[PDB]
Each structure stands twice: as structure tokens, then as C-alpha cells.
């Protein structure tokens, strides 16, 4: 039926170099996700328009001038062609779907004339191809060389030449008119071996600027391609230049792989002491942002300066307003997004306004009405699993790939306790009692344990409940005292926990991912590899049997909401069993789903690195 309004989506494609784009003279920000492109309003941080036409993951993004259609590359599997896709604007649908570059797409760009679109093969199959836009067909093709190129750029004028740089090579290619060939001219630099990363061309094709892993910003002339000036004087960028762009005044924004964002005024200057010699590029303004800078786009405010949208590797979006009048550079943090593979969701009991997300680097906290994440409790190396709230409103439990559980609080302060060696390796599921007096931990090496917890003294008891495989999920009746442990063998086991004697329940047809009680009933709903949403009996039975990973229920058993390897979200009238109000466009293997108890909202989260919000209506 598909009525499900998409209220909010938080996410960002971090390490997609030059992935961030701003609509030229438009009100939209364009940036990629797991496998989609997102066009947000420039102002209203709700109006999103998503484009989903790729199969695996967007890899490169290019946008032609004049707000015209934009091209999107794609990564694919080992021996299957990539898929460049041209997406129209003013209609926001597909136009052409071109296929080459058997491994992945490395770089794309439009010419000043919107008629030519150049592509660059992956690590393997690295060749330079030209495409026509009217006919989605390849005009010209040629392999660059052994040292694989990295970035390519059309000239701002004369849309007939284009410069490309890579590992140990720079070239300028001109498209011949007599044939389907394009002739390269190599770059001549004096005994210099630089791994060029980013390349920009000035407005008038005078000088090409090129970043370097060493940290230099080599500016070269383009009439002849020879080299002119090295880079920033009074030092050197720390992690090498990664995200370079040009401000219309003739200066260059440079962002290294550490967060150093500075402005180099590049006008050929004579060396003061030695007149027949040039200086290096000075630095007008400088700042520090959080994380390696990967993408820079421009927005002409023209009142004082310019506002540049800066996407950093840490999935943060900054608004860097710089005015050269007083050489003042101020940054703002517009939007943040998680990094990758959000592992666990958590809702505080009887609270439908704030929630928490356990990811592969650390725990973040968000709230309902706005993204506006509250805090990020960081643990450097090892990743978190199965975040949990202690019942009735209490600490946050987090079991890590170390095999240790740790407790934090609201402000989360300092670690409440660390149950170390909680399992052999990689504790996987964690639950608490309704009295917050014991904590269940199901590890990845097929074991279940429980720890008794006092007020300030912890109790390490030796339950050692042996299970048949990794424990995907653990649930407990909030009404009484019981336990259910799922498995990567699907044999969901009912433990009594009064005697710890493994009430002999077993369910074996495949291996399961998520099990849920019916609220105040002897029923069960389990989800595993094969499409199975079977309703069980707590009295060793199966009421009914109807790739799925996550399940959730309402206050009462109204709407069982579900998701899995399929990129959809299925809502079910629990008692009736129909798939009403099905939602789409979650580009990746969805991992968890929540119901926001008090209100009617379904939060969905998957491995793509994003979070989605929907409403909730059941017949």
C-alpha cells in the first residue's frame, strides 16, 4: 500500500571524496548515502528528495553547471561492470544508464559544455573514457598508464581539454576532432615525485592547483603544463592535501587530512631577498575542524564573503563562512551523521522523545523532534554491540567486541563498571531484569551468562548457560521472570531464571535474528534467515507460520513492524497478519527498528550508516 511519510533521515556519505555538492543558484544540498543520493532543502532541514537507482553503493558524484542533470558513479562486485547513471533535474528521474569500468568508478566530471561527460576507471581497468549526454554512449577511450590516476577535471573554458592527476603522473588530454582519439601531454616537474590527490582549475585555465600527500599545493601553468610554485610557506599541511577548492577572488581553500582548513592567496610574487625568484604561497586565514576534510562546495553569499559547505570524513557537515575583507574565517557545524554500520538501537523505558545509537566507534544519543544529537561517548578502537537501557530508567549498558560489558550514565560521566571477560569474544546480546538486578549477556562464542548487580558492588555469578551458537537476541518478560535467547542456530531457548534450568523449548528450521514477546500473552514472534514471522506458543507450540532481521511491537500487539536483508519495512496487523503500510528506500541491510512507545513513530536503522523516521497507522 505504501502510506508511510518519511519524516526525517539522518546520514551522510563521509569518505566519498568531492561527494558533497551544492545546487548552483539553487536551494538544495546534494550528497550521497549508502546507495542513494539525497537532495535536502538548503534551509528547511526536513524536505528531502532521494534518488535510488544504484545497486551496491554510490562511489563518485558530479554535477554539471546550470543546475542541469548530474552523474553518479557506482562501486560493484569483483567482476561485474560498474554503472554510471545520469539523473535529470527539473524532473528528478533517470535519463541514461551507462556500463563500463568492471571494478568501480573512480572519477566523473561534466565539461563546461554540458555535452561531454568524462569517466575514470577503478583501480583495475583504469582507463579514461568520454561519454555523450544525448546518447548515453562512449565517444573516446584510452588507458592512462600503469600508475593509476585519481582525479580528472574539465577545463572551465574550451570544453575540449581536461587535466588528470594520479599516483606519479599528471597529464592534460585534448580530444581530437578528426577521430575518436584524445591526445595526452605529460607533466614535466623538476625531479619531483608527488602523489597528487585533488586537482582544481582556476576560472581562466591559467594555473592548475594540485594537492599532495606530502602536503604541498603545487600550482602549475597550463599553457605549458610545467610547474611553478610549491605550496604553503611557513610550514606544510599535516596529513597531505585532500580537499582543495578555489574562491572566486583567485585564492584557494585547502583542507588537509587532519582538519586544517586554510586560505592560500596564489598571486605570483617575487622573492623579497632574491628578486629573480618567487615566494611560496602564504596563508591568509586558517582554522581547525574535526576530522579529515574530504569535500568542499561553494555558496556565494557576497555580503561579506562566501559560505563553503565542508564535508569531513567524520560525516560532519560544516558551513565555513569566510570574508577576505578582514580575512576572517568562521566555521559552523550544520549537521552531523553517524559514521558507519550503526549496530544497536535503544529507547529509554517509557520515553518516546530521546533514543541512543550504538555504532562501530562509539555511542551517540539523539532525540525525536530534531536530529540534534546530544552526546557521543567515545571508545577509541573496539566497537560497541547491543546497547541497552537498564530498566525503569537507569544506566546504559554496552558490550564491546573486547568481550567486556561497560556501564555509563545519562551524562555518562565515568564508567559505572566494567564486567571484563563477560564472554570469550564479542558479547553480542545484552538484556536486563525488570528490577535492574541482573544482566544477561549472550556472547558470540555460543554462551549465555547473567551477572547479579547490587547498588555499588557487582556480583559475578557462574550461570554459564551453554547455547548452540552466537546469541543474536535476548528478551525477558517485564511482567514476570523468564528469559529467551535466540541463536545463529535459531534454537530459541526459554530459560526460567528462577532455577536456571533451561525450560526445554527448541525451535529449529533455520537460524534466527530477532524474537519478541506478545505483550502480556503466551505468544512469540521470531525472525531468521528464511522469511518466517511464525507465531509460537510459550506452551511449546506454533500458532501460525508466515530475509528478515529485526522485529518490534506496540504497547499492545497491534502492529508488528519488521525488517531485514530486504531493503523494505513491513508493518503488520498482528492479529490479522496483513502487510499494510509498507515502507521503502532504506538502502542497505536494515538492522534494528523501534516503535517510540508513547507516540506513533517507527525508527529504522541499518548498516548503511543512516537512520529513518516514519509515522505509524494501523487499521
Amino acid at each position: 500500500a505504501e502510506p508511510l511519510v518519511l519524516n526525517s533521515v539522518i546520514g551522510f556519505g563521509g569518505a566519498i571524496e568531492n561527494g558533497l555538492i551544492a545546487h548552483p543558484d539553487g536551494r538544495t544540498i546534494i550528497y550521497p548515502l549508502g546507495s542513494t543520493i539525497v537532495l535536502r532543502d538548503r534551509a528547511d532541514p526536513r524536505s528531502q528528495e532521494f534518488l535510488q537507482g544504484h545497486s551496491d553503493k554510490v562511489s563518485c558524484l558530479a554535477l554539471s553547471r546550470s543546475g542541469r542533470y548530474l552523474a553518479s558513479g557506482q562501486i560493484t562486485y569483483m567482476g561485474f561492470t560498474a554503472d554510471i547513471i545520469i539523473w535529470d533535474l527539473e524532473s528528478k528521474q533517470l535519463i541514461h544508464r551507462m556500463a563500463l569500468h568492471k571494478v568501480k568508478v573512480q572519477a566523473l566530471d561534466f565539461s563546461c559544455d554540458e555535452r561531454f561527460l568524462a569517466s575514470l576507471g577503478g583501480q583495475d581497468d583504469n582507463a579514461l573514457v568520454l561519454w555523450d549526454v544525448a546518447s548515453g554512449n562512449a565517444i573516446c577511450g584510452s588507458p592512462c598508464n600503469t600508475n593509476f590516476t585519481n582525479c580528472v577535471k574539465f577545463f572551465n573554458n574550451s570544453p575540449d581539454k581536461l587535466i588528470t592527476a594520479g599516483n606519479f603522473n599528471m597529464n592534460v588530454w585534448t580530444y581530437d576532432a578528426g577521430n575518436n582519439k584524445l591526445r595526452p601531454t605529460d607533466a614535466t616537474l623538476g625531479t619531483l615525485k608527488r602523489v597528487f590527490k585533488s586537482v582544481v582549475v582556476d576560472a581562466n585555465d591559467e594555473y592548475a592547483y594540485c594537492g599532495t600527500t606530502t602536503g604541498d599545493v603545487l600550482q602549475i601553468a597550463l599553457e605549458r603544463v610545467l610547474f611553478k610554485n610549491t605550496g604553503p610557506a611557513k610550514g606544510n599541511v599535516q596529513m597531505g592535501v585532500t580537499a582543495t577548492c578555489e574562491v572566486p577572488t583567485g585564492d584557494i581553500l585547502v583542507g588537509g587530512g587532519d582538519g586544517s582548513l586554510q586560505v592560500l592567496r596564489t598571486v605570483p610574487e617575487p622573492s623579497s631577498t632574491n628578486p629573480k625568484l618567487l615566494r611560496k604561497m602564504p596563508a591568509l586565514a586558517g582554522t581547525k575542524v574535526e576530522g579529515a576534510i574530504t569535500s568542499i562546495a561553494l555558496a556565494d553569499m557576497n555580503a561579506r564573503g562566501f559560505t563553503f559547505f565542508v564535508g569531513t570524513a567524520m560525516c560532519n557537515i560544516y558551513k565555513v563562512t569566510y570574508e577576505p575583507a578582514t580575512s576572517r574565517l568562521k566555521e559552523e557545524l550544520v549537521q552531523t551523521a553517524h559514521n558507519d554500520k550503526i549496530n544497536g538501537m535503544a529507547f529509554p523505558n517509557e520515553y518516546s522523545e530521546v533514543f541512543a545509537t550504538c555504532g562501530t566507534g562509539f555511542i551517540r544519543l539523539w532525540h525525536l523532534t530534531t536530529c540534534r544529537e546530544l552526546l557521543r561517548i567515545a571508545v577509541p578502537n573496539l566497537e560497541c554491540f547491543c546497547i541497552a537501557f537498564t530498566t525503569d530508567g537507569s544506566a546504559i549498558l554496552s558490550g564491546w567486541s573486547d568481550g567486556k560489558i561497560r556501564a555509563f550514565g545519562p551524562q555518562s560521566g565515568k564508567i559505572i563498571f566494567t564486567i571484563n571477560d563477560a564472554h570469550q569474544k564479542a558479547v553480542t546480546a545484552i538484556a536486563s531484569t525488570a528490577d535492574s538486578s541482573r544482566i544477561l549477556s549472550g556472547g558470540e562464542e555460543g554462551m549465555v551468562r547473567v551477572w547479579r548487580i547490587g547498588r555499588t558492588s557487582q556480583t559475578l555469578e557462574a550461570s554459564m548457560k551453554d547455547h548452540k551458537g552466537p546469541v543474536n537476541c535476548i528478551r525477558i518478560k517485564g511482567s514476570g521472570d523468564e528469559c529467551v535467547s535466540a541463536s545463529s542456530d535459531g534454537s530459541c531457548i526459554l530459560w526460567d531464571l528462577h532455577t536456571f534450568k533451561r525450560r526445554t523449548s527448541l525451535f529449529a528450521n533455520t537460524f534466527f535474528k530477532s524474537v519478541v514477546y506478545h505483550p502480556d500473552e503466551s505468544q512469540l514472534v521470531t525472525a531468521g534467515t528464511d522469511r518466517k514471522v511464525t507465531y509460537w506458543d510459550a506452551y511449546d507450540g506454533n500458532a501460525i507460520r508466515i530475509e528478515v532481521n529485526a522485529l518490534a511491537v506496540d504497547r499492545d500487539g497491534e502492529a508488528l513492524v519488521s525488517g531485514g536483508g530486504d531493503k523494505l519495512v513491513k508493518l503488520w496487523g498482528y492479529d490479522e497478519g496483513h502487510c499494510y503500510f509498507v515502507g521503502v528506500a532504506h538502502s542497505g541491510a536494515i538492522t534494528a527498528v523501534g516503535v517510540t512507545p508513547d507516540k506513533q513513530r517507527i525508527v529504522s536503522v541499518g548498516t548503511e550508516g543512516g537512520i529513518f523516521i516514519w509515522d505509524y497507522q494501523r487499521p
Binding site: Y77, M78, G79, T510, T529, D530
Partner: protein, 428 residues
């Protein structure tokens, strides 16, 4: 355990292996990506017989592809399931074979054995319990006969205790796709007899009839013939792969089928086999499968069992059935055509069965037979060889690789000694 290492010699052997490794890849429910996507645990319990572990939950086939002129090895690499093979398991030489057994076994064979034998060993210790070898031949061509037997001799001197299977496809009596064919046939026979334990013989001719009449095929391509051989190649190892109320390892098939160290040339056929028409009428019953396999049509070898006498036999079913049915069926037949069997062997059949059926069907079977009618093929070949060796036709090629003529006398004498042995136990 019971891991099986696989070889694919010559073009045909390289080609039928593309199907056999495509059928089994589906029976166990893995993807051409190498990642398993079946449903049961039974696909994974004995998956080790045909595959190896790989990083990322991937399984790659334990196959070895040898061929001079690597042109065709591009085809299988471009096939839908060419992505699963280990590209270091692609041994080839650029110079052609010439359909000369000598250079395939004296000059060009010798230069690749060191590489191949390095490959075979690289995956012989990877087996916690190596059961045996298995090869895919074609006795007409130069690589298959030449390299395979030369490869076979090397295997025997280092793996004597293990068993060397051979899915050899023999030349045809009436048809000859090449001209020097009988030479490479006999010269290989002088090698198979002494360095092999079991050797099925199959021929394109009956493969054309079985395709033509029973399946009602119009245009039999090569893949279909190999599609058939892929089936009987999978029908053998159901006991090693799947459960069975009466399992049957290969080593117990050999001891149950060869009374003497040199009567080891077999004959095969598949069941059930029906077009899309009669499958809507025919029913799958134990009686159906046993009469079809016992017939003298389904024998893929171009031989007539009626002219001979079954020394031994066997049957490999698969599907949930009453084993008593199969018990009496083989007892009925052993009584009716009592002339086609031997006397000094009281019960000369082995009746195996497996509990797991084929993928889409529910029941199936496979026949094996060590009859003395197979000596008929060796009579034909021994004629053509002695006709041209009577005139030394095409012979300058063979002495052109250091070879001699005594070898042509020896190989023929052994063929005569062999066919004679199948006559002793043939008292009409």
C-alpha cells in the same frame, strides 16, 4: 572427511568439468560468488568433499584444470561459474597438442608435470583424509591421453594406496572426429591398465541416442551431453556427501566390482530420464527406475550387454524409498535373465541408496556395470591400430618425439591380453 581432489584433462575434460562444477555448485546451494546460500545444514556437513574454505565464508572448488593451448581455459573462465576457480589452478602451455600422444606424453607433458605435480601436492595435504583422485579424459586427443596418463603415472608412484578414478570418454567405433584416434587410444590403454583402479568408459554415440529417443531432444549440444555426465558424476558421491541407510564409499565399490586386478573397465547410465510430456504421465516408483537402468539402451558406453555377461553390477538410488523394494528388484532381475550373469558369483550386485534426493526431482538412480561386453570396444580399436601400423601410417610423427615401435607392439599385446581375459570369464 573423505575429501576428493579433481582433475580436468584435455578440452573435453576441461569442458565437462564446467558442468560438473556447475551442477554440484547448485546441489550444495552456493553462488558463483562462492558464498553459500542454500537452506539446510546437510549442504554444509560434507561440503568439504569438493571445496575448500575461503576468506569471507567462501568455498572454492578443489579442481585442477590442465590443458595445452589455454584458449579454451578462457571460455570456462568466462562461463557463468568460472569465477569460483582458483586462477592458480590453471596450468597450461601455449604450444598445441597436435593430437600426438608422444609430445603430449614425452616432450610437452614432461615440461608441465613439474608445475602440475606442485599444484596437486599443494592441495593433497589440505585434505585431512584424502579419499581418492578422479579425472576426466578423452582418449582421442593429444593432451588428454598424453598428459593424463603421464600425470596418472606420477600420481601412482607417490599416492599408491589411494584410488585413481577415471571418467574417460572413449573414441567412437563408427565415428572418428580425428584420424590418428586409435593410436592415442591404445597408447593410453597401455597406461590405464597398470596405473588405475576404476575406469568408466563412455562414448558420444550412445550419448546421442540417450539424448535423442528418451529425452526427445532435437538439437543435442555438447553442454547437454556434459549435462548428462555431470549427473552421473554427481550420482556417485551421494554416499560421501549425503546420508544414506546403506552408504557406499568408492573403495567398497571397487572391491565389490573388480575380482581381478585388471578387469577394471566399467559402464554407466542414468535414471530417471524423460521428456516434459511423459513426466506428466509417468510416476516415480522403484520399479520404474530399475527397469530403465537395467536396459541395454541407457548404457552410455557403445556396447551391448546382451552379447556379454555381467561379472558385477551396482545401483545408486537417491530419495526416500522402501529399501526392500530395491532388495527384491535386483533379486528378480538376477533370476530372470540368469544367462547374462555369472555362476561362481552368487549375488553379483550391490544395492546402495541415499536419503537425499536430487534438487528438483524426488527420486533418481544410476547404473554401473562390469560386463565382458566392454571387450567389444577393445576389439574395434585393436583392429584400426593394427591396420595402420600394418602400414606404419602417420608414424613419422610418433617417432618424431623419441618414441619407438616396440611401444606400439607392447600396447597392442596388452590390449590383446586384456580382451582375452574378458573372454575367459565369458563362457557364453
Amino acid at each position: 572427511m573423505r575429501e576428493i581432489v579433481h582433475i580436468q584433462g584435455g578440452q573435453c575434460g576441461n569442458q565437462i568439468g564446467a558442468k560438473f562444477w556447475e551442477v554440484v555448485s547448485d546441489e550444495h546451494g552456493i553462488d558463483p560468488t562462492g558464498t553459500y546460500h542454500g537452506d539446510s545444514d546437510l549442504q554444509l556437513e560434507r561440503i568439504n568433499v569438493y571445496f575448500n574454505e575461503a576468506t569471507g565464508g567462501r568455498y572454492v572448488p578443489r579442481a585442477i584444470l590442465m590443458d595445452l593451448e589455454p584458449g579454451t581455459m578462457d571460455s570456462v573462465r568466462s562461463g557463468p561459474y568460472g569465477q569460483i576457480f582458483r586462477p592458480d589452478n590453471f596450468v597450461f602451455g601455449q604450444t598445441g597438442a597436435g593430437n600426438n600422444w608422444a609430445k603430449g606424453h614425452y616432450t610437452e607433458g614432461a615440461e608441465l608435470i613439474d608445475s602440475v605435480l606442485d599444484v596437486v601436492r599443494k592441495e593433497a595435504e589440505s585434505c585431512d583424509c584424502l579419499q581418492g583422485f578422479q579425472v576426466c579424459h578423452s582418449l582421442g586427443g593429444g593432451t588428454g591421453s598424453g598428459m593424463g596418463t603421464l600425470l596418472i603415472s606420477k600420481i601412482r608412484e607417490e599416492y599408491p594406496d589411494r584410488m585413481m578414478l577415471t571418467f574417460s570418454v572413449v573414441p567412437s567405433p563408427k565415428v572418428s572426429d580425428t584420424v590418428v584416434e586409435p593410436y592415442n587410444a591404445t597408447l593410453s590403454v597401455h597406461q590405464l591398465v597398470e596405473n588405475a583402479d576404476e575406469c568408466m568408459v563412455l562414448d558420444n554415440e550412445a550419448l546421442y541416442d540417450i539424448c535423442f529417443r528418451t529425452l526427445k531432444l532435437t538439437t543435442p549440444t555438447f553442454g547437454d551431453l556434459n549435462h548428462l555426465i555431470s549427473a552421473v558424476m554427481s550420482g556417485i558421491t551421494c554416499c560421501l556427501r549425503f546420508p544414506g541407510q546403506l552408504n557406499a564409499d568408492l573403495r567398497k565399490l571397487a572391491v565389490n566390482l573388480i575380482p581381478f586386478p585388471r578387469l577394471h573397465f566399467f559402464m554407466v547410465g542414468f535414471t530417471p530420464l524423460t521428456s516434459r510430456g511423459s513426466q506428466q504421465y509417468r510416476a516415480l516408483t522403484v520399479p520404474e527406475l530399475t527397469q530403465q537402468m537395467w536396459d541395454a539402451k541407457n548404457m552410455m558406453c557403445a556396447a551391448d550387454p546382451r552379447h556379454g555377461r555381467y561379472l558385477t553390477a551396482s545401483a545408486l538410488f537417491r530419495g526416500r524409498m522402501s529399501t526392500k523394494e530395491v532388495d527384491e528388484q535386483m533379486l528378480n532381475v538376477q533370476n530372470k535373465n540368469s544367462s547374462y550373469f555369472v555362476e561362481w558369483i552368487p549375488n553379483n550386485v550391490k544395492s546402495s541408496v541415499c536419503d537425499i534426493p536430487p534438487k528438483g526431482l524426488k527420486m533418481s538412480a544410476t547404473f554401473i556395470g562390469n560386463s565382458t561386453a566392454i571387450q567389444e570396444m577393445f576389439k574395434r580399436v585393436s583392429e584400426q591400430f593394427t591396420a595402420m601400423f600394418r602400414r606404419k601410417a602417420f608414424l613419422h610423427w610418433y617417432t618424431g618425439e623419441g618414441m619407438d615401435e616396440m611401444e606400439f607392439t607392447e600396447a597392442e599385446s596388452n590390449m590383446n591380453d586384456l580382451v582375452s581375459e574378458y573372454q575367459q570369464y565369458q563362457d557364453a
